[PDB]
Motif scaffolding. Structure first.
Motif, PDB file in Angstrom:
ATOM      1  N   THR A   1      64.501  31.837  24.580  1.00 53.37           N
ATOM      2  CA  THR A   1      64.131  33.225  24.886  1.00 53.37           C
ATOM      3  C   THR A   1      63.366  33.349  26.197  1.00 53.37           C
ATOM      4  O   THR A   1      62.498  34.212  26.337  1.00 53.37           O
ATOM      5  CB  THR A   1      63.341  33.888  23.751  1.00 53.37           C
ATOM      6  N   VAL A   2      63.675  32.497  27.172  1.00 51.86           N
ATOM      7  CA  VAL A   2      63.164  32.705  28.520  1.00 51.86           C
ATOM      8  C   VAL A   2      64.022  33.724  29.252  1.00 51.86           C
ATOM      9  O   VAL A   2      63.552  34.811  29.601  1.00 51.86           O
ATOM     10  CB  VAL A   2      63.082  31.377  29.287  1.00 51.86           C
TER      11      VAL A   2
ATOM     12  N   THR B   1      56.442  39.700  26.505  1.00 54.32           N
ATOM     13  CA  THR B   1      57.199  38.527  26.965  1.00 54.32           C
ATOM     14  C   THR B   1      58.697  38.804  27.028  1.00 54.32           C
ATOM     15  O   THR B   1      59.517  37.932  26.735  1.00 54.32           O
ATOM     16  CB  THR B   1      56.918  37.282  26.117  1.00 54.32           C
ATOM     17  N   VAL B   2      59.061  40.023  27.418  1.00 54.36           N
ATOM     18  CA  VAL B   2      60.461  40.353  27.640  1.00 54.36           C
ATOM     19  C   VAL B   2      60.798  40.006  29.082  1.00 54.36           C
ATOM     20  O   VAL B   2      61.640  39.141  29.331  1.00 54.36           O
ATOM     21  CB  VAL B   2      60.762  41.824  27.324  1.00 54.36           C
TER      22      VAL B   2
HETATM   23  K   LIG Z   1      61.803  36.561  27.987  1.00 49.54           K
END
Ligand SMILES: [K+]
Ligand SMILES: [K+]
Lengths: 688, 688
Positions: free
Chosen positions: A239-240, B239-240
């Motif tokens: 999920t980076v 943290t998107v």
């Molecule tokens: K992200």
């Protein structure tokens, strides 16, 4: 009721089903078969990693990698026919089935056709059948070879060397990868599903990273396309998501929407399993929990600065080393804990020089009641001048016995190494502890209580006398400090001097169980010390039994003249009593007693018709006499006394017998009247 | 000892320290100090939200928004002078200090200067000071007005309506936001710290979203700039991270590296607190982990199918509705649980028609032993022909008494609503249960077992008779169905004569406490039984002497003759007990027998020397003659028994008292004996 619990009982039946017949069916624990299981595990790992790379990155394999997947299919075609000769370690009926019709079945209705379809050559069939695209989707049957990896993580979850919540984390980390390898292969395949003129509407044909443009992407090297797709899939899985590589089509948007929805659940499951591993605490925080629970109660009770450093030292000793798990052991019952103690402590107690050759049951009674204890260096266990409450056996370590003269002169008396005991010369004795037993190196003492080593020392009196002989057969303790106590407690008589007294007190109180537990272990005497009494002289009569079984046991000698001249018939008949004098006479009891005539005259004189009829009824001849040779009729005619000589003369006694004055009981009774006994003596006189 | 127990103690002594003097100090929990603690709470929220927006987005406020921050500063100086007239709860004690010198102190050594130098107008003395951008960093002192919000979140965990863990995630959701408002403001501020010619090297000056270029960004309106910066800060906080807005400078890179490092541990702390909220689970999974524990033991025991529904209907009546937490009740001690039972159950038991006119201690003695129970409709509780073992009191709901006679059909004989207890006439009228009491509406029965409602019934016998005579006799107490049984409840044999039997029974073996309690609760009027006995008859000598004090007993009339003619001293003489025959002479001590001469005349014939001495030493008048005018000495001389006629003649008897024959004991002894008793009775014949 073993059909209810086939798991708790009947676990390993081994005998009658190893070599029934057929001599071929391998047990699934053979060393030649578990060397094939790892080989097929390596082949299954390779053939499940290469299969999405064969699907997504090629359209038919090249002329190389042909012998490679030919032998890859051969190495599984061997394993297909090899599982017809492997046994059936079962689920409900816990026995490895050897019957090769329950081996062919349970397999044909299971992973056979999914494992036999996956060994057909699906890239020779592909290139033979006109190169059709939907015959290459049958390569995905070869992902059923991850059974051999998920069976490896089931043979590892029941392996107790590794925590099961760690094998779950390793299983999730082998599910996290290979779902990024397969997703990379499917993400490249969804770019190859568009024609090469529409390649600018794909994720890789419209890619430009740095100064390198990925145009005409089917002519790049395989390890650049695979690394690009795997880099996308791994930065998507983590999920980076940099967005340098993203979905462009709708068929790639749909796949990314499926794939991140799978990875969200998978990452949440990984976080949950890691947290569930960490909440099962480590050694340090389980130390610190009770350490902060024990700093309080040491701050409010205001303990001293040395006792605090001893308590913290022992708490830091039970953690961080030497994991004494008796608190886990307390669920085990007393019999199996006694078997554990006989396994662990009998090599140490049997080599103690105190127990030079005792009975095995006595050493068993010792090792049943033992406790393991650990002490740091510098601790004082038993100090000089106090009572001894525990007996200690040094299993391993090094101790130090000391003593002081006047001014704290701590000189080394001895050094108690392994297989030594201290506190033993003061439980035998009743004195103070003579030595300050101080610790030199980290020891492993075995503690026995004082009250246990009095109960099992007075029960086992032969072994107790052996222990006293072990104490005196020494230098008489001049190896320590020459503190000689008499000769210890000396031979104190528990053979006859107290055990006959103990069994006699057991007969006096009326305890039949203590009586037979004493006499069935031998040692049934006929004499007491300090008297002439017997366990028949007490119980039987004076006590008058308490317990009816006190006469049948062993047939002890009746008519034993005691120190005061009383046979047990006389003791049974004095207290009157009417069962033992009814029962002793058929056993051959007798009324032997010196000066019995004088005793009968005194019982005439006091006046007791019950006592005298019990004397005469239990066997007594009233012609025996006294110093003046006077029969009991001669005194029962003295003070009147009708009805007392009547019961005498019906028991049998002649009238004509003289005395010191030459008088018969005829004219001795001629002081009272005609009815008063003279008619009775004359018509028992002239009746013969 | 109690000084350790400071805050865990009485704690309510504010009453004396309330208004000693000083006449101004406001109590903290006032009402006008709760229209200030919310007014300046929503002022502190505004000023804390506007301070980074005043710092970041402006370089001095415009000519508008002047009265706004003027009134915002004067409201906080009104609070800064109003906090000098407010008391405070002390920390180590629990008393509100009202002293207006410990109000000026404890405040000046605390948050006073940070709430006073964040009250100067820092925009007025920035613009009128030769404007420098380091006197605008003193605006950040007004972030010490977040004390009011964290005080509001400290006066919210003291509340009990909401969980303490939901408040610890609401506080974290107020820390998550406003760390993105401040980060948005000091992310735009780092873009305004570069000159406007270097604006292309910023995050907002080099920004182009869509077709809108953000060039000359200081002339865009405030809300587009704020929404842009806040959109960056919120897609960074979550943290998107789309990367359409990213850091460009080195100061913005440094700030983003600080900010995501803060938000990582803030999000991990939020996830941990949300998880800890769910680990303390809900009722719908406290039921499911209990019920699958009841699926086994209903499968491994193989129960039926109506019982398996009766069991599972009571566990979704425990959970999921009607939360009976009585497992959390039992750690409360029995005294305080008895007080809880006296508070709750006493209006229910006080209105039951069983207890109309009972004593208060009886009702208090049965409400301790009650239990709450709930039953679904359709269930039967006590069926017909079964032995009763519980007594039930209805609180709400509706029961139904049903009886079946011959054909299986039942008739609604009585609908048992509230205060309509059942199970009562099968213990008093000790028969089987006559009804099948069935639930027709969800009830709240109070259960008392049968064994307790026998002990409390027999102890409180007055309340027991009160129960069994007032039990709906005005409305024909067999008022459900006919129940033809003669004398069901009206004194079937338990009377005011049975306690006399209880005193006699306890006295016969001797107790000193049960007969004392029965004569304290009742009396000792020498109540008797069928044979005319007494406690003095049995307790003294029939059962042998238990205590010496049983014969005095605060004054009892001696010489109470029973139906047999025996007196409590004749019982002594027949029994023995020389101490008792010594004690009984203190009272009247008569020996009135009609055939006393005949009793002496037959005890010289049976043969007794000790019994006759107990007869004559207690007073017997030892010359009274029988029907043939024969004295005791007459028969003792005719039979000629020495040592018994002596005991008669020293005790006082005439020796010339003749008989119906006119034959004296003088010639009777001469005809019987040649001994003639001349130094026995001839010398007392010539004594007169
Ligand atoms: K992200
Ligand atoms: K995350």
């Amino acid at each position: 009721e073993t059909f209810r619990w086939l798991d708790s009982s009947e676990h390993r039946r081994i005998e009658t089903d190893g070599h029934n017949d057929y001599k071929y069916i391998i047990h699934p624990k053979n060393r030649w078969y578990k060397a094939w299981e790892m080989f097929i595990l390596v082949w299954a790992i390779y053939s499940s990693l290469f299969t999405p790379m064969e699907f997504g990155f090629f359209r038919g394999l090249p002329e190389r990698l042909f012998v490679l997947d030919i032998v890859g299919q051969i190495a599984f075609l061997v394993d297909i026919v090899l599982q017809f000769f492997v046994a059936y370690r079962d689920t409900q009926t816990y026995r490895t089935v050897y019957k090769p019709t329950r081996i062919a079945f349970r397999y044909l209705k299971s992973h056979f056709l999914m494992d036999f379809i996956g060994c057909f050559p699906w890239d020779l069939i592909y290139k033979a059948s006109g190169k059709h695209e939907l015959v290459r989707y049958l390569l995905w049957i070869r992902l059923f070879r991850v059974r051999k990896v998920v069976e490896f993580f089931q043979r590892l979850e029941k392996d107790t060397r590794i925590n099961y919540l760690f094998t779950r984390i390793l299983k999730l980390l082998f599910v996290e990868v290979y779902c990024t390898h397969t997703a990379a292969c499917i993400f490249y395949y969804l770019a190859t599903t568009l024609p090469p003129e529409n390649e600018g509407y794909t994720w890789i044909g419209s890619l430009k990273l740095g100064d390198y443009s990925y145009e005409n992407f089917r002519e790049i090297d395989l390890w650049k396309r695979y690394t690009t797709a795997l880099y996308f899939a791994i930065v998507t899985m983590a999920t980076v998501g940099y967005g340098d590589i993203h979905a462009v089509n709708l068929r790639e948007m749909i796949f990314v929407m499926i794939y991140v929805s799978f990875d969200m659940v998978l990452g949440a499951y990984l976080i949950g399993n890691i947290t569930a591993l960490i909440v099962k605490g480590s050694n340090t925080e389980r130390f610190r929990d009770k350490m902060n629970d024990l700093i309080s109660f040491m701050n409010r009770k205001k303990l001293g600065r040395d006792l605090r450093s001893q308590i913290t030292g022992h708490v830091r000793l039970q953690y961080d080393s030497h994991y004494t798990d008796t608190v886990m052991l307390q669920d085990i019952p007393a019999s199996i804990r006694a078997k554990i103690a006989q396994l662990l402590y009998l090599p140490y107690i049997k080599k103690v020089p105190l127990f030079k050759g005792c009975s095995t049951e006595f050493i068993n009674q010792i090792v049943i009641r033992l406790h393991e204890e650990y002490f740091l260096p510098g601790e004082v266990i038993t100090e000089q001048g106090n009572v001894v409450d525990h007996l200690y056996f040094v299993c391993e370590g090094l101790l130090e016995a000391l003593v002081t003269k006047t001014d704290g002169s701590e000189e080394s008396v001895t050094l108690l190494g392994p297989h030594t005991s201290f506190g033993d010369i003061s439980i035998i004795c009743n004195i103070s502890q003579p030595f300050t037993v101080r610790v030199c190196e980290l020891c492993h003492l075995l503690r026995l209580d004082k009250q246990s080593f009095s109960n099992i020392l007075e029960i086992y009196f032969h072994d107790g006398r052996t222990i006293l002989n072990n104490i005196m057969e020494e230098k008489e303790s001049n190896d320590r400090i020459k503190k000689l106590e008499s000769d210890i407690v000396i031979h104190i008589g528990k053979q006859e001097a107290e055990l006959a007294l103990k069994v006699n007190s057991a007969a006096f109180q009326g305890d039949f169980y203590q009586l037979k537990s004493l006499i069935r272990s031998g040692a049934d005497p006929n004499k007491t010390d300090y008297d002439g009494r017997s366990p028949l002289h007490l119980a039987a009569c004076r006590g008058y039994e308490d317990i009816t079984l006190f006469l049948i046991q062993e047939g002890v000698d009746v008519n034993l003249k005691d120190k005061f001249g009383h046979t047990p018939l006389f003791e049974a008949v004095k207290a009157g009593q009417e069962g033992v004098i009814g029962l002793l006479v058929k056993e051959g009891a007798s009324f032997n007693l010196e000066d019995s005539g004088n005793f009968l005259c005194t019982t005439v004189a006091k006046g007791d018709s019950d006592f005298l009829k019990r004397l005469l009824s239990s066997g007594m001849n009233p012609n025996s006499e006294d110093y003046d040779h006077r029969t009991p009729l001669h005194v029962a005619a003295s003070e009147g006394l009708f009805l007392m000589a009547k019961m005498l003369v019906e028991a049998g006694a002649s009238v004509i017998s003289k005395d010191r004055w030459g008088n018969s009981p005829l004219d001795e009774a001629r002081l009272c009247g005609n009815k008063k006994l003279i008619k009775l003596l004359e018509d028992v006189k002239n009746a013969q």
